[PDB]
Design a protein around this ligand. Structure first.
Ligand SMILES: *[C@@H]1O[C@H](CO)[C@@H](O)[C@H](O)[C@H]1NC(C)=O
Ligand SMILES: *[C@@H]1O[C@H](CO)[C@@H](O)[C@H](O)[C@H]1NC(C)=O
Ligand SMILES: *[C@@H]1O[C@H](CO)[C@@H](O)[C@H](O)[C@H]1NC(C)=O
Ligand SMILES: *[C@@H]1O[C@H](CO)[C@@H](O)[C@H](O)[C@H]1NC(C)=O
Lengths: 94, 220, 223, 40, 49, 49, 120
């Protein structure tokens, strides 16, 4: 009914969490990790983004350490790093 | 800590060569050092490959034992009907294995005044079983197709792909930063000349080879 | 010599011809009729085998199955996820494909996964290596993609920062240190997976007809 | 024109297991026939 | 087909529920009358002028 | 989904926008357009499908 | 489909002659232990493949009928493999076909050309 919520603490693991921990060991900074509550990866609806693009572009987040795809619009709004894995597209069938 | 060249460019820069008449590859490093001319050949890369029945034991063994127990029960109940008439057992087994034989046997016809229906239904049943078996036996990966393949990103002893040692194609593959795994795979099988690569792929030692297109079309 | 009223056994034993001797045919007319009936049985068996013989799906992005599955009798359907960059990649590639996705909409990733496990979805466009991971962790190697991304887009991932961040060069040097020493290969080895004629109803119905045949044989045996 | 245009149930490895299982069935049948002859 | 035969009948379906949704959003009513012919309409020349 | 003899072909072109035929300049068009946009932003076509 | 060399390949035919010699020797041994199957076992063994042979009176010791049934099942699965070999043995659909890139998916290649230095 409204935008009321609570701060739930949850644990994180996986590939991008290991990348975040190795960047915290190498660059030696303090990470401020939080899950996005707006939605999925991102789609601009009338100059309103959502997700990690809506957090980074609208000056609410600094960087996207987690997994983020690369297309033309995300090459326009922000800048990416060097590639490290070839994860294209495919079709899962029965 | 100086980067140099070898072969034709090692003789061109040292005075032992004056005109390279060869398929020279145009890239960033060779265009800034020496001058080029009009390209006479337009040619691309391609992959050289080697493109050249569940009977009983791979087939599942439930229905074979089912047909065996079925013909056993049929022979037992035909022998019991031969007992209760409205070499007896040997002739009963001969008839029960001669109906299923389906090729010709020197036999006769037993007394089947109340058993000819069971024999004709078993004959049609055996032929429709072997007909369905013939039908579902008659009704029932070597290619690479380019460089975009994650199966080559995780290779094995069968997905063997290599290139010519100290080649400009290897330089172009080394320049792209997302081609590190295929470079590490091709550096373990470095081949000197093209004839050695043809001899290796002919003797069933290779499965893929990056090479120019028109040369392999002439070899085809 | 039993062709007075008992010609059914001889006639339907000469249908299949399973080496059943009956009598010695001395008449020419009987052998001509048996030969014509045997030729009819041979062409009927040929038509029956032709009926039994007549009784990877999509091999490209430019395939006609993405337009319409009219080439085959069962139709299929597919869709992508909302609020993602895959829809923008489709709209940059083909707005017609975006309208195909707009017709066959769906809910989400886990809902499409449940639809694939229960059979409520045929195809699902997603990433290349992640569907390989889902196929490897699949029980029994059932859900297998068509190929592994041969002539598809073949995109990559990256780390996005703000336009004007001074920390970008250090993160780029850290990623070049992480890739160029075998550590990224160790991460791709550790956090990924490496695991991944017969019919039922027809001979069951033949068994029901065989049980009816045993019932009829019991009726003819008791009387 | 002078260079480019000028052009010029296997039963070996697949039915090897077929041959092995058929030969084993033949040996088993011959053994059953000789046991049947030696009995009667 | 018929010279003059128009009776009150029941209209429903997809566009009718769309019009009910539009009347639910903004406070207004409607009155559905059916078209006489079964043609969409082209730029046809009339027999005079 | 009703009969077993209706299969559409592979040809599908002229994919235009079917909407609501409106009149000329009038203040009762903007609220209708906002109602249609409210139908766009939610699952108004999905449940009707 | 001029001539087929796939099922026998001139290497299995020696094993056919060896099996004919073995069945003939077994028939000679049974006839010595005990009727034209002394040296004429080839027509009796290979003749039971195409299921229209003359019915030969088998002995009552249950000797020949078992190997006749085994050879009959071998002939049935051989004819099944022959029909599978026969079953395993428009051209261009359009621009979406894989033949325009390379017809390597099929066995014969083809070729095409237009007018030299034209608008085509
Ligand atoms: C995308 O996110 C919005 C909320 O920002 C949500 O309302 C919508 O249902 C999501 N997906 C679609 C269908 O656009
Ligand atoms: C709906 O009713 C209200 C009553 O105050 C008023 O705004 C108007 O008559 C109607 N128009 C709208 C906003 O749909
Ligand atoms: C015009 O005249 C034609 C006969 O020439 C007639 O059929 C038609 O109904 C008339 N009306 C119009 C405007 O088409
Ligand atoms: C309806 O349209 C008018 C403009 O004609 C606008 O001022 C008003 O805010 C709109 N009301 C609603 C509820 O959309």
């Amino acid at each position: 009914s409204t935008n009321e919520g609570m701060n739930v603490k949850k644990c994180c693991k996986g590939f991008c969490i290991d990348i975040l921990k190795k960047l915290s060991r190498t660059v030696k900074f303090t990470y401020d990790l939080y899950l996005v509550t707006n939605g999925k990866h991102g789609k601009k609806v009338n100059n309103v983004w959502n997700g990690m693009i809506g957090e980074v572009v609208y000056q609410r987040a600094v960087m996207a350490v987690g997994s983020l795809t690369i297309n033309e619009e995300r090459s326009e709004v922000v800048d990416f790093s060097v590639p490290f894995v070839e994860t294209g597209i495919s079709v899962m069938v029965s | 800590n100086k980067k140099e060249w070898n072969g034709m460019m090692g003789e061109l820069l040292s005075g032992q060569a004056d005109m390279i008449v060869a398929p020279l590859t145009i890239n960033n490093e060779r265009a800034q050092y020496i001058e080029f001319s009009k390209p006479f050949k337009y040619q691309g890369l391609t992959i050289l490959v080697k493109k050249e029945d569940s009977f009983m034991q791979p087939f599942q063994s439930t229905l074979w034992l089912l047909v065996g127990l079925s013909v056993h029960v049929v022979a037992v109940m035909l022998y019991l009907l031969d007992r209760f008439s409205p070499l007896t057992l040997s002739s009963a087994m001969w008839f029960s294995w001669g109906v299923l034989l389906n090729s010709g046997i020197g036999e006769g016809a037993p007394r089947s005044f109340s058993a000819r229906i069971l024999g004709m239904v078993w004959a049609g049943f055996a032929m429709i079983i072997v007909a369905s078996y013939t039908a579902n036996l008659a009704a029932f990966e070597e290619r690479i197709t380019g460089i975009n393949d994650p199966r080559l990103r995780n290779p094995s002893d069968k997905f063997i792909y290599a290139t010519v040692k100290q080649s400009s194609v290897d330089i172009y593959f080394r320049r792209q930063v997302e081609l590190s795994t295929m470079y590490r795979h091709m550096e373990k099988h470095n081949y000197e000349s093209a004839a050695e690569a043809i001899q290796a792929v002919r003797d069933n030692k290779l499965h893929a080879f990056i090479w120019d297109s028109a040369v392999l079309e002439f070899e085809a | 010599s039993f062709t007075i009223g008992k010609a059914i056994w001889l006639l339907w034993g000469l249908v299949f011809n399973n080496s059943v001797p009956v009598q010695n045919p001395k008449g020419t007319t009987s052998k001509i009729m048996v030969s014509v009936w045997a030729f009819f049985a041979v062409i009927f068996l040929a038509s029956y085998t032709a009926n039994l013989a007549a009784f990877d799906q999509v091999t490209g992005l430019s395939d006609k199955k993405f337009q319409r599955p009219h080439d085959y009798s069962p139709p299929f359907r597919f869709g992508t996820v909302p609020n993602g960059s895959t829809e923008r990649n489709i709209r940059n590639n083909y707005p017609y494909m975006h309208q195909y996705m707009t017709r066959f909409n769906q809910r989400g990733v886990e809902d499409a996964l449940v639809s694939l496990k229960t059979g409520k979805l045929d195809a699902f466009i997603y990433d290349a290596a992640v569907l390989n991971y889902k196929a490897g962790r699949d029980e029994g190697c059932k859900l297998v993609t068509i190929g592994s991304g041969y002539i598809f887009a073949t995109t990559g991932y990256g780390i996005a920062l703000q336009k004007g961040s001074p920390w970008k060069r250090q993160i780029d040097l850290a990623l070049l240190q992480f890739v160029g020493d075998g550590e990224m290969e160790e991460l791709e080895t550790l956090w990924l997976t490496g695991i991944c004629q017969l019919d039922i109803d027809n001979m069951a119905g033949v068994f029901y007809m065989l049980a009816a045949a045993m019932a009829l044989s019991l009726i003819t045996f008791i009387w | 024109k002078t260079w480019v245009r000028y052009q010029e149930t296997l039963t070996f490895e697949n039915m090897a297991g077929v041959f092995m299982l058929v030969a084993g069935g033949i040996v088993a049948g011959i053994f059953l026939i000789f046991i049947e002859i030696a009995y009667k | 087909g018929s010279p003059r035969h128009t009776v009150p009948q029941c209209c429903y379906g997809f566009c009718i529920d769309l019009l009910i949704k539009l009347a639910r959003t903004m406070n207004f009513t409607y009155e559905v009358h059916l078209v006489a012919d079964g043609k969409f309409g082209t730029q046809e020349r009339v027999n005079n002028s | 989904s009703q009969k077993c003899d209706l299969v559409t072909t592979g040809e599908l072109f002229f994919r235009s926008g079917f909407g609501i035929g409106m009149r000329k300049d009038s203040p009762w068009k903007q609220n209708v357009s906002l109602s249609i946009l409210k139908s766009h932003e939610n699952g108004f076509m999905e449940d009707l499908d | 489909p001029s001539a087929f060399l796939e099922p026998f390949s001139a290497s299995v035919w020696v094993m056919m002659f060896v099996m004919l010699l073995i069945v003939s020797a077994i028939a000679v041994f049974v006839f010595e232990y005990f009727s034209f199957t002394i040296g004429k076992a080839i027509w009796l063994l290979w003749g039971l493949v195409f299921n229209n042979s003359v019915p030969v009176q088998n002995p009552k010791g249950t000797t020949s009928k078992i190997m006749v049934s085994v050879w009959a099942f071998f002939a049935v699965i051989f004819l099944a493999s022959y029909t599978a070999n026969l079953a395993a043995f428009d051209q261009v659909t359009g621009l979406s076909d894989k033949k325009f890139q390379r017809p390597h998916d099929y066995s014969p290649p083809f070729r095409f050309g237009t007018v030299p230095n034209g608008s085509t």
